[PDB]
């Protein structure tokens, strides 16, 4: 599923990401834009052989199982394919564990490089929330 901007904002808010660990909703929308272009089916292979999955490009080295990332963990206790669902529940629940792990949203490379420190409120401007 390719979400619209305000449609994703609403879904993330319902699932409890607005201000989760102090990260306002626009941070999460911005991260999703630059990680996946709002496409739940996005996948991207990394040099190390791990893969990033879904709307927030959650990586198989630590967070999910894809059966093809040797030595990896599955800290969210989910198949990586669950992160590709049109329902963002699994991705949100896993993102909550990631962002709680010490480094906050810096875990998301595109967030750090493209969202952090910017006017992220722009991402939710005009949305009915
Ligand atoms: Cl594996
Ligand atoms: Cl933080
Ligand atoms: Na894994």
The DSSP-derived string for 16-43 is T-TTBTTB-HHHHHHHHHHHHTTBTT-E
Q: Please provide residue 27's backbone torsions phi and psi, each rounded to the nearest 5 degrees.
A: -60, -45
Question: Experimental method used, please?
Answer: X-ray
Total domains in the chain come to: 1
| Ligand with an atom nearest the CA of residue 61 | 3
For residue 105, with 0-12 CB atoms within 10 Å meaning exposed, 13-18 middle and 19 or more buried, which class applies? buried
What are the φ and ψ backbone dihedral angles of 2, each rounded to 5 degrees?
-100, 115
> What's the alpha-carbon Rg for the chain, to the nearest Å?
14
- Looking up residue 51, the CATH number of its domain turns out to be 1.10.530.10
To one decimal place, what's the resolution in Å? 1.3
Q: Is 101 annotated as a binding residue?
A: yes
Instruction: Give residue 57 CA to ligand 3 midpoint distance, Å.
Output: 13
**Is residue 52 annotated as a catalytic residue, yes or no?**
yes
Among the listed residues 48, 52, 66, 87, the single catalytic one is 52
Q: For tokens 């709680």, what's the residue?
A: 100
Q: How many helices (H) and strands (E) in the chain?
A: 4, 3
Which ligand is located closest to the Cα atom of residue 104? Answer: 2
The span from the CA of 117 to the CA of 84, in Å, is: 28
- Rounded Cα distance between 43 and 56, Å, is 10
* Residue 27 domain boundaries: 1-129
């Amino acid at each position: 599923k390719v979400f619209g901007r305000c449609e994703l904002a609403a879904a993330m808010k319902r699932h409890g990401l607005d201000n989760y660990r102090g990260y306002s909703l626009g941070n999460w929308v911005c991260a999703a834009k630059f990680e996946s272009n709002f496409n739940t089916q996005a996948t991207n292979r990394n040099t190390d052989g791990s893969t990033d999955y879904g709307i927030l490009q959650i990586n198989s080295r630590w967070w999910c199982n894809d059966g093809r990332t040797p030595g990896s963990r599955n800290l969210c206790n989910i198949p990586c394919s669950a992160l590709l669902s049109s329902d963002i529940t699994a991705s949100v629940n896993c993102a909550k564990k990631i962002v709680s792990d010490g480094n906050g949203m810096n875990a998301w490379v595109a967030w750090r490089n493209r969202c952090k420190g910017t006017d992220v409120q722009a991402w939710i401007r005009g949305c009915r929330l």
